[PDB]
Design a protein around this ligand. Structure first.
Ligand SMILES: NC(=[NH2+])NCCC[C@H](N)C(=O)O
Ligand code: NA
Ligand code: NA
Ligand code: NA
Ligand code: NA
Ligand code: NA
Length: 190
């Protein structure tokens, strides 16, 4: 169903839906690993489905329709603790590449494309443990897509060769993120 922000479990999968308090987002859980998000003039939000906790060797399957009109991402997205990390394997994005301004550290080839690798830092921002300073790890796919599989270990291995180490996994989902934009998406995870 359509829900307010929160986390939980639906039809065998973990879900997380977060927003910054602005209006405009409709997040709906569906059967199985399905979710839908429609946004009209949102602020910042993140929603999707997957697992609590994730693993360092999961092969994640996704498919569906992704139609951003402005700044948005479609990603494998999750967190670790000790160290506290927010990470992204970005499969598609709208008008804004999330790595803009960031220092490139390397490349990895996985699941039919090269990805470029970046680290960023978030200072005194929201996190899974409350306000915190933490690093973000990014793999950004050069060839955008709306369905496929992601061998997460290929990314996690490549990040570790640049000192981008992960802690104990927290959640791991396929997420749609938007930032002061509009769009529509409907995705099935497995
Ligand atoms: N990329 C983002 N917008 N991240 C939002 C993180 C939200 C954070 N985990 C919280 O529960 O407050
Ligand atoms: Na974007
Ligand atoms: Na995303
Ligand atoms: Na991949
Ligand atoms: Na995770
Ligand atoms: Na996200």
């Amino acid at each position: 169903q359509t829900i307010q922000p929160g986390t939980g479990y639906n039809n065998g999968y973990f879900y997380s839906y977060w927003n910054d308090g602005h209006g405009g987002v409709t997040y709906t859980n569906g059967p199985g690993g399905q979710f839908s998000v429609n946004w009209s003039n949102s602020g910042n939000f993140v929603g999707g489905k997957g697992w609590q906790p994730g693993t360092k060797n999961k092969v994640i399957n996704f498919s569906g329709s992704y139609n951003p009109n402005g700044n948005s991402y479609l990603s494998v997205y999750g967190w670790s603790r000790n160290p506290l990390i927010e990470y992204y394997i970005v499969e598609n994005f709208g008008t804004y590449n999330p790595s803009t301004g960031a220092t490139k550290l390397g490349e990895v080839t996985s699941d039919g494309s090269v990805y470029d690798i970046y680290r960023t830092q978030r200072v005194n921002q929201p996190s899974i443990i409350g306000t915190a300073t933490f690093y973000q790890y990014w793999s950004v796919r050069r060839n955008h897509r709306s369905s496929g599989s992601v061998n997460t270990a290929n990314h996690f291995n490549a990040w570790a060769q640049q000192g981008l180490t992960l802690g104990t996994m927290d959640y791991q989902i396929v997420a749609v993120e938007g930032y002061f934009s509009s769009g529509s998406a409907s995705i099935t995870v497995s």
